[PDB]
Symmetry: D2
Subunit: 169 residues, 4 copies
Amino acid sequence: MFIKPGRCPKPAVQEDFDAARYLGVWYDIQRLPNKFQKGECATATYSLSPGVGFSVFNRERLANGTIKSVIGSAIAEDPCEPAKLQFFHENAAPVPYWVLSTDYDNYALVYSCINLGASHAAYASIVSRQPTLPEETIKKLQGTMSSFGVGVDTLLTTNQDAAYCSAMN
Amino acid sequence: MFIKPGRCPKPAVQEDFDAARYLGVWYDIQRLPNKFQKGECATATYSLSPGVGFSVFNRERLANGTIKSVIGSAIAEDPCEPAKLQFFHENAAPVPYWVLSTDYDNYALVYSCINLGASHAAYASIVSRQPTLPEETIKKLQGTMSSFGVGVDTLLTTNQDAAYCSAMN
Amino acid sequence: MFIKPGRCPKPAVQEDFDAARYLGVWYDIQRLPNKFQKGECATATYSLSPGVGFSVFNRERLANGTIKSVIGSAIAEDPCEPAKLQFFHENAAPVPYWVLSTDYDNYALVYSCINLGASHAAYASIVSRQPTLPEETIKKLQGTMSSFGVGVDTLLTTNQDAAYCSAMN
Amino acid sequence: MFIKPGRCPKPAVQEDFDAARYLGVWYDIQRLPNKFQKGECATATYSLSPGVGFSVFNRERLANGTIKSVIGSAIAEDPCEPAKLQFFHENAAPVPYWVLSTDYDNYALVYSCINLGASHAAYASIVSRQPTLPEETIKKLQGTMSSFGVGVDTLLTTNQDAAYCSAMN
Ligand SMILES: C=CC1=C(C)/C(=C/c2[nH]c(/C=C3N=C(/C=C4\NC(=O)C(C)=C4C=C)C(C)=C\3CCC(=O)O)c(CCC(=O)O)c2C)NC1=O
Ligand SMILES: C=CC1=C(C)/C(=C/c2[nH]c(/C=C3N=C(/C=C4\NC(=O)C(C)=C4C=C)C(C)=C\3CCC(=O)O)c(CCC(=O)O)c2C)NC1=O
Ligand SMILES: C=CC1=C(C)/C(=C/c2[nH]c(/C=C3N=C(/C=C4\NC(=O)C(C)=C4C=C)C(C)=C\3CCC(=O)O)c(CCC(=O)O)c2C)NC1=O
Ligand SMILES: C=CC1=C(C)/C(=C/c2[nH]c(/C=C3N=C(/C=C4\NC(=O)C(C)=C4C=C)C(C)=C\3CCC(=O)O)c(CCC(=O)O)c2C)NC1=O
């Protein structure tokens, strides 16, 4: 199910989060089933913004081979909680985006949850600075997710194959 | 699906909504599939509150024959929009509850929607002051729902059979 | 003034806050200057409600001798943070109400703050189960307030004189 | 004062608001007394952003001759209400910004309001594509404001004198 029992959890986020080091390209390695990703090879690119926060450009490769993308803006509405962001994507209502853990140069774990009464809808992603990530790191991040009730066996492994994804350039 | 494409619609609500005439017992006649109703024979009872708004007591009959209930509070956070309520149920995050149409003495149409990025999760109910409602009224209210994109063929018809539901008293 | 520089602070709230023990009558002992209290002898009475949360009845004695009162409802929108309440007063927009500290039987310190861009508007009150409170307790609670930036120097001392407030009954 | 009785009004906003035509430089002509503008010669510059919405750069000239400025991002959280924006200024909490009326090439009237219980704090500004605006336009826009309860009598007339504001360049 996309909708799960219980209200949203409140996991810990990355201490001393530094958005400048978080900028650049991230590859989707695993993610919870969701409605927005329609393809494979997903990347997120975060870039400087003349205003506050940073800009967002997400791209994926659809089955027909076309590259589909969305633009957005990311802002931490409380400057004292810089890892707790609101993402504003074109044609979407705002969604939360929490950086739960990152070392900036290899991996990040991101989490988002919206309450639906006594249920909730959550999204989570393990991302990497490369199209792959070591199994040891994946299992560690999955452990973090399990610790607050995420169904890790539901995680999808994103296709990042070099040939299949060549159209991403 | 419980989660549907598009952001929440903004249907018109009942003009000149009068919560005092809305109080009392309502029977669930049809509703969109949802996660909270686990049984049949559902009723909603709205009662006076010493504070602002009104109090909520929802009851249903589970398959095992036990009656399960929840208490809540209903408040219109903007007094100038009295038909646009927030419902606060025990152990639940707040949810919207809009009275789209009612004649107070026979039927009401209620709607609730929460945005999930570019998707949404909606709930809707046709309720009656009696365990049944005339087909003509049902079709009229379904027409209202269709006019803003609700999938009316997905509506569930609640079992309100006198014998099956006798445990509701 | 009423609006001061900086965003609202997030002070710690009462651990294991038990609303049931918080019910009953409280006397205003000191409070920050505000727009709603126009007289003296202020009291807050919190009572059981059939729904969630509790009901609110605040009364004060105006300079002309008239007793003025308001009703409201109090609800903790996040059940896991029971001391962080939203108060809904008749014809008012919702306002936050945080129980920072209480021993239920003698005193409580309440705090509320709303952001106004790079400024904020804050309210705070020391209340007592009696019309007076020990000077030692008061100094203790003022210490808490000044610890997160409240200007305790601006606190008003509420007239609770038994003769002046006799109209309160 | 800055805080006045009653909840925020909901004035009508500019129909078919086109952010692209709203970009560029605006001069503050009149504004309600507020906490953020500490000088004169105020200007707002709105620019393209790679993400959603637009970027904000506000500048003014303090009495000591120093130019003070702030950066921010503007986003319409509901794409169907493009004139109802949220402004995120550096180190400030989010604030509403509603374009009530503009012809893009000459004037705009902006409004913002935040509820404080049964009171409110409002901001409003008349801006112009030039350092001055025709008296007729000004009276027109004041009429709009007074029509929903703004105290136009309290409006400050911003010093845009070319010599006094020369440091703005
Ligand atoms: C996103 C929207 C959304 C809404 C609107 C919603 C309402 C809501 N209905 C609830 C229970 C309930 N609600 C009902 C019945 C009704 N409820 C009604 O709103 C009406 C009109 C009827 C009947 C006429 C009953 C019978 C229960 C108790 C369910 C049970 O405990 O078995 C609960 C309690 C939590 C739970 O048991 O899951 C919530 C939060 N929840 C949501 O996520
Ligand atoms: C309830 C939570 C919730 C979240 C978090 C959410 C994010 C989000 N991701 C989007 C697109 C996208 N998002 C991604 C990828 C990513 N996105 C990421 O947050 C990360 C970490 C990656 C990859 C590493 C891509 C590739 C698209 C474009 C999808 C497409 O247009 O095909 C959109 C655009 C609207 C849409 O296309 O449906 C939203 C709102 N939506 C939600 O409802
Ligand atoms: C920004 C924060 C903020 C808060 C917290 C707030 C509370 C609040 N207190 C109110 C009335 C009142 N409140 C009080 C007293 C109390 N109230 C208390 O919270 C406590 C602890 C006491 C006393 C112990 C009384 C006596 C009234 C009625 C005042 C009157 O009608 O004369 C009202 C009614 C609207 C009004 O008359 O202005 C609100 C919204 N308003 C705000 O804007
Ligand atoms: C409750 C409502 C509310 C609003 C709208 C608001 C806007 C706002 N304007 C700001 C600065 C500023 N805003 C302006 C000017 C403008 N600003 C405008 O919205 C327009 C139309 C002009 C001029 C045409 C300038 C010049 C600064 C920098 C002030 C300075 O740093 O000295 C800031 C920075 C924080 C601060 O310095 O206080 C905020 C939050 N703040 C609020 O509390």
